[PDB]
Amino acid sequence: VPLDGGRFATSDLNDLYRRVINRNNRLKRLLDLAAPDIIVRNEKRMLQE
RNA sequence: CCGGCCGGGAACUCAAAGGAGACUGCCAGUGAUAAACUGGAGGAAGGUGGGGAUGACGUCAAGUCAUCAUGGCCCUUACGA
């Protein structure tokens, strides 16, 4: 929801699923790029977190 | 006396052919879930892989009567030989 003035009074539910997906799309990107193991796997670390 | 000179062999180089194959088959991004384009792996060859042949109705009364033939015109003691 918008805040009077020009800001946002949002419940972090969004700011976590956004994270679940920012990281998620970046992960699929990192695989089309075919980056080395431990790096894209460190990405799956961030996916499970 | 290694310009394979003499045996020997049938897989290959080469060649005459029956066929496989490459068709956007797969992943991803972009994008109106369509099509399409780019990159990469796969792959002998990749985005109709390259080239020739194939030239849609027509434009130009453009070429050939000098391959030849032809409705006709001229010559037939001739230009015919």
Q: Whose CB is within 7 A of strand B?
A: A 28-29, 32
Give A34's strand partners. Answer: none
Solving technique for this entry? cryo-EM
Closest CA to A47 of A29, A32, A33, A7: A29
* Strand B nucleotides in reach of protein CB atoms, 7 A cut-off: 27-29, 39
Say how far A44 CA is from B53 C1', in Å: 59
Contact assessment for residue A31 and residue A47, using Cβ atoms and an 8 Å cutoff: no
Answer for the pair A43, A22: CB distance below 8 angstroms, yes or no.
no
Overall resolution, Å: 6.7
Tell which phi-psi region holds residue A5, choosing left (phi > 0), alpha (psi between -120 and 50) or beta.
left
